[PDB]
Symmetry: C4
Subunit: 228 residues, 4 copies
Amino acid sequence: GSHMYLRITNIVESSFFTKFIIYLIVLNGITMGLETSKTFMQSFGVYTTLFNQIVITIFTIEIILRIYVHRISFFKDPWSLFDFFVVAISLVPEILRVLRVLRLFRLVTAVPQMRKIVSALISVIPGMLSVIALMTLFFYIFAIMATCLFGERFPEWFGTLGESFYTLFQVMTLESWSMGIVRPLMEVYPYAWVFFIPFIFVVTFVMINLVVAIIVDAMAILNQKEEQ
Amino acid sequence: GSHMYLRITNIVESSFFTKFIIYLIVLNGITMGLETSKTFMQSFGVYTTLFNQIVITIFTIEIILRIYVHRISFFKDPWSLFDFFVVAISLVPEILRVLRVLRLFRLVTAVPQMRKIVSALISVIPGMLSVIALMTLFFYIFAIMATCLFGERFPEWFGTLGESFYTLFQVMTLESWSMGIVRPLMEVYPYAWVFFIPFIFVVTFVMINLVVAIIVDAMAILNQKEEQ
Amino acid sequence: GSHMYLRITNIVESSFFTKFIIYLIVLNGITMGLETSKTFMQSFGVYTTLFNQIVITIFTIEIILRIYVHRISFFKDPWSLFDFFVVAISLVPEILRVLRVLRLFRLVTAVPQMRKIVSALISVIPGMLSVIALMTLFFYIFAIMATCLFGERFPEWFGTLGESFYTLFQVMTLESWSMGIVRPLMEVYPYAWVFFIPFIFVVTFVMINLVVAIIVDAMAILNQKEEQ
Amino acid sequence: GSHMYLRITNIVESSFFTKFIIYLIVLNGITMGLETSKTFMQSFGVYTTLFNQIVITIFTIEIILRIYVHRISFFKDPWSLFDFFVVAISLVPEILRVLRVLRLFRLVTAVPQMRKIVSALISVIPGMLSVIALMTLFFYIFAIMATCLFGERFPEWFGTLGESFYTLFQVMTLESWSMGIVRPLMEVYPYAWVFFIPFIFVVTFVMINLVVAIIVDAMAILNQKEEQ
């Protein structure tokens, strides 16, 4: 709480400061779409690599100041921890060059209207873990069974626990599940439909129950407020 | 508010007038389905091109009168602004010859039972913009990543930000997402599933949360009325 | 209300009578599944064609008695009008030989637990007509546009209003909409995505709003009862 | 209620006991994933077949003790009846070697947080039987019609009641229903769309009504509690 501290804290917690930073995120945003074009990169490639290293310096300063002001309150703030990690990524000198584009998610971290909706969304998840747990177990058990039942004749789709996880996931989205996977399978395993139809019933029932549960946990609130 | 004015206003705000106009929309409606057949156009093509230019004169008169009556109250009315734009389109002397068929939407503008439902539908959208914003950002960031990760080997699906937007949209509808796109992709990018499964989870979760939110914003009303 | 009348009315409105008829529907039911097999029809084909003509006599007697008892109260009863029409069909001496199997729906007409659910289901529809109207208009207008824009190069999918209706219906279910239809279309019509993505947005939005509306019209009731 | 009895009952109803058993389920769980790999089975195959026969002895002891304690209260407990049947399966000396993996569902039987969600899920089903009955009848009648209408030219998809059940199920999930099945069918049966579009409408409507009904049966409860 010294004189220097508060001088900084006045700049950081400024309107102008955020608006500045949101202006840059949006500008880098546009920059990163243009950098997607070889034509654009063939002419103005120099300029945008300059602008990229500028912005990422500015954001390191920005994150350093914010730490000066906020102390370990910073490192217990999700939105700040996010901002930390997306800028840190951008600092390391081939998948990482791409993961840089995750800095545009700073538009979410910095615009309150965005933060609101992301919070609303994420707060739905705790009441889902039990069902997600059930489901992940359901899949593990089926992935094993399928790997034994069909891996040898159908290595592409079932040769491996992971091939089976992937294929079972595809069947749950109902993508080409019959013409793509089960119809071919039955050409060797007449009774394969006894594995896949029950699998599709369980998985779809649980998804429906999952969504009904989000709709109720939501109404539970509205029918506490209106009880007052 | 002169004597001539009110003479017109009595005709325009008439029952007979609307019923007349709804009769023509329905008749032009039928006309435009028959004009779809070369056989029909080979014989009665003369007749229907007559009828088309008649109706569109009648509708210009109609829109001119309505402006006489309604003043700048007209140009702050969505339903009237719509009617203006669909008839204006039909006035310009090859995509435009087709866009003419948008005049059949005048059946919505003119039948109150229709206007009601279109209003109910459109009023749902403001409470969606935040999530739509989040989603459009989510897509922009993924469209960029995918264009870098897969464009070079997969130009058809990812060579361009726009190719990537289109392909990501297809993956969100779950259309051929695995047999069509990701299974082919993994034949070169074993770990592509780490991009597409998380993408499908986020996008589907948000869609579910979107719909749950429409169901709650709706119940919020019914549990204000019943609080009275 | 004579002595003969009431003698009949006592038989018709009997328990035993219904249970008898439900026993036959279930038995004809089983019969019609076995008649599906050439093997079974090669041996026991005589027997089941006997049993079929027996049951359909019995049901004509049954429907005649029920008319004796119920008068024009019969011909203002949906469930009875249904029973009339499915048995009448079965009386006419090649699609009609197949439509006979609609008599198994008599299991719905005759079992109250079934009638209940069918009523619950059908009562949902009146509050849908407006949206269905909107949608059918939406389709008519798009079916026309698509027939003009793509019929000439894509006759199979768009050459005709009806081909276009069918194809647009397929796009609304999202079945092969991109790999099957729009990706092929863009190979000649780069901008076809400007027709199909907006079409998919509108159609999906309306379906969601339709379902949210069924969920509210349902809650409107539960929050009238609990207002008492 | 003797001295020996209670000595056992103190062990069985122990914390330590369950935690032990949950530790083994999780350990066998891991074991059964590794047993999925020929590499792993080529080296450590001996070890895991040992561990498998150990665990399944331990679980037989476990189930025997639990019966000693619980009497016919055991054989009227779903969770215990389940545990009985999954271990019994594992005791019989080729599909059965695979069905063994169903013992990992003991993680559901033994973890209360899991039991809770499985109960929530299963309790939804009684209020669905009527609609499921309606649907199964709907399918039986359509499966018959389709087998007659398309089996002869389309044996793969319709030659048999069961082929037709399977194909109708695929059409209900909307998987390749038009490009895969109906478009091919119309190449011989122009009017096949009059069978499949109505089938898709009915089936989808009922599914929607089914889900709306789960959402209401759920709200019926929350608006009994808040009536108190």
